[PDB]
Amino acid sequence: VNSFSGYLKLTDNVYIKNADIVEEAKKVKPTVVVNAANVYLKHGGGVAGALNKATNNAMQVESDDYIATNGPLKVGGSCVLSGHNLAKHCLHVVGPNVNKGEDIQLLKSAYENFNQHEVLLAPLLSAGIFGADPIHSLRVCVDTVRTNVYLAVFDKNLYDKLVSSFL
Numbered sequence: 215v216n217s218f219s220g221y222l223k224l225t226d227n228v229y230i231k232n233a234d235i236v237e238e239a240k241k242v243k244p245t246v247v248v249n250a251a252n253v254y255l256k257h258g259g260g261v262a263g264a265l266n267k268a269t270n271n272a273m274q275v276e277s278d279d280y281i282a283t284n285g286p287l288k289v290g291g292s293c294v295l296s297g298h299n300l301a302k303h304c305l306h307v308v309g310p311n312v313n314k315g316e317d318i319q320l321l322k323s324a325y326e327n328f329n330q331h332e333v334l335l336a337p338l339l340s341a342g343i344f345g346a347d348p349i350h351s352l353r354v355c356v357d358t359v360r361t362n363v364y365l366a367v368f369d370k371n372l373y374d375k376l377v378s379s380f381l
């Protein structure tokens with residue numbers, strides 16, 4: 215038993231809700247919140263901009279030190295950093311950004327990072343400003359992640375569409 219409330223169950227291990235991942239995180243304080251990161255951990259907009267703002271920019275400060283030490287992530291890769299006031303940990307995961315021409319097949323590799331964590335609160339990778347089809351992203355999530363994933367979908371309209379088209 216865990217504290218996630220109001221999710222629709224899609225599969226044995228994947229759950230979905232219409233929620234602001236930021237407000238979902240502040241209430242649940244999950245062990246892991248997933249950020250829709252880029253390789254530079256520049257958290258300017260989309261989910262990343264919203265998460266970072268909710269930490270009062272502490273996420274960005276920590277991220278800049280991480281990059282200064284380690285260099286950029288790989289597309290399809292991830293790193294674990296602090297969850298600040300939102301979660302114990304933040305798993306920064308880089309899905310491909312279609313608006314940069316990145317290969318969509320890397321979306322599966324991105325979701326594989328979730329399997330290193332028993333339970334996660336997460337957005338749909340490569341959705342929103344990353345330019346991928348959220349329905350494809352949901353399919354890859356279901357077909358790749360084996361651990362327990364609670365997906366927060368900000369837009370009520372897309373949420374309804376994802377549920378209604380889910381196979």
Ligand SMILES: C[C@@H](O)CNc1cc(N2CC3(CCC3)[C@@](F)(C(=O)O)C2)ncn1
Pocket residue numbers: 233234235236250259260261262264337338339340341342343344366367368
């Ligand atoms: C209130 C909002 O500002 C932040 N709260 C969100 C956003 C979100 N999206 C997902 C997405 C990141 C990968 C696709 C995104 F960038 C996009 O849909 O463009 C933003 N998902 C959950 N909560």
